[PDB]
Amino acid sequence: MQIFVKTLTGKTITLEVEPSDTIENVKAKIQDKEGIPPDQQRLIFAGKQLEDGRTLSDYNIQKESTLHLVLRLRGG
Amino acid sequence: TLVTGSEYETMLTEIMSMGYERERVVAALRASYNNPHRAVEYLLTGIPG
């Protein structure tokens, strides 16, 4: 299923995932395609911060949903 | 090149969609120095005062 990840710079990335994928997996796909280290990623959906060991189905994320990506960092 | 106000309400609106009313983020701007991203990272850490 396709999902959208909206970043704070107005870039939206599309990912192909399965509801059975874990949040850790999603973060690895984002690293693979945009290069952001998983440790800097904070994923938000329906006002909840997503936890690494849960799956997308745990949160009821359906096709064409948009997650928000906030970056955690102490540098530029 | 944009005025202070404009970008201001634009911070709100962005961080807004992020479940952060214009007031929490704008006040977060008062606490972020006018920054948006920091405004929300602020929305996070909390809203002391």
Curated annotation (Swiss-Prot), chain A:
Originating organism: Homo sapiens (Human)
Site feature Interacts with activating enzyme, where: R54, R72
Lineage start: Eukaryota, Metazoa, Chordata, Craniata, Vertebrata
Membrane topology: Peripheral membrane protein
Record PTM ADP-ribosylglycine, positions in chain: G76
Residues with site note (Essential for function): H68
Cross-link Glycyl lysine isopeptide (Gly-Lys) (interchain with K-? in acceptor proteins): residue positions: G76
Protein name stated in the entry: Ubiquitin
Free-text description of this protein's post-translational modifications in UniProt: Phosphorylated at Ser-65 by PINK1 during mitophagy. Phosphorylated ubiquitin specifically binds and activates parkin (PRKN), triggering mitophagy. Phosphorylation does not affect E1-mediated E2 charging of ubiquitin but affects discharging of E2 enzymes to form polyubiquitin chains. It also affects deubiquitination by deubiquitinase enzymes such as USP30. Mono-ADP-ribosylated at the C-terminus by PARP9, a component of the PPAR9-DTX3L complex. ADP-ribosylation requires processing by E1 and E2 enzymes and prevents ubiquitin conjugation to substrates such as histones.
Domain Ubiquitin-like intervals: 1-76
Residues the record lists as Phosphoserine modifications: S65
Positions of post-translational (Microbial infection) ADP-ribosylthreonine modification: T66
Subcellular location: Cytoplasm; Nucleus; Mitochondrion outer membrane
Outcome, altering S65A: Prevents phosphorylation in case of mitophagy. Decreased localization of PRKN to mitochondria
Result, substituting K48R: No effect on HLTF-mediated polyubiquitination of PCNA
Cross-link (Glycyl lysine isopeptide (Lys-Gly) (interchain with G-Cter in ubiquitin)): K6, K11, K27, K29, K33, K48, K63
Function noted in UniProt: Exists either covalently attached to another protein, or free (unanchored). When covalently bound, it is conjugated to target proteins via an isopeptide bond either as a monomer (monoubiquitin), a polymer linked via different Lys residues of the ubiquitin (polyubiquitin chains) or a linear polymer linked via the initiator Met of the ubiquitin (linear polyubiquitin chains).
Swiss-Prot record, chain B:
Range within the parent protein: 156 to 204 of 363
Domain UBA: 6-46
Domain notes: The ubiquitin-like domain mediates interaction with ATXN3. The ubiquitin-like (UBL) and the UBA (ubiquitin-associated) domains interact intramolecularly in a highly dynamic manner, as each UBA domain competes for an overlapping UBL domain surface. Binding of ubiquitin or proteasome subunit PSMD4 disrupt the UBL-UBA domain interactions and drive RAD23A in to an open conformation.
Family, similarity comment: Belongs to the RAD23 family.
Superkingdom of this protein's organism: Eukaryota
Subunit (UniProt): Interacts with XPC; the interaction is suggesting the existence of a functional equivalent variant XPC complex. Interacts with PSMD4 and PSMC5. Interacts with ATXN3. Interacts with UBQLN2.
Location within or outside the cell: Nucleus
Task performed by this protein: Multiubiquitin chain receptor involved in modulation of proteasomal degradation. Binds to 'Lys-48'-linked polyubiquitin chains in a length-dependent manner and with a lower affinity to 'Lys-63'-linked polyubiquitin chains. Proposed to be capable to bind simultaneously to the 26S proteasome and to polyubiquitinated substrates and to deliver ubiquitinated proteins to the proteasome.
Full protein name: UV excision repair protein RAD23 homolog A
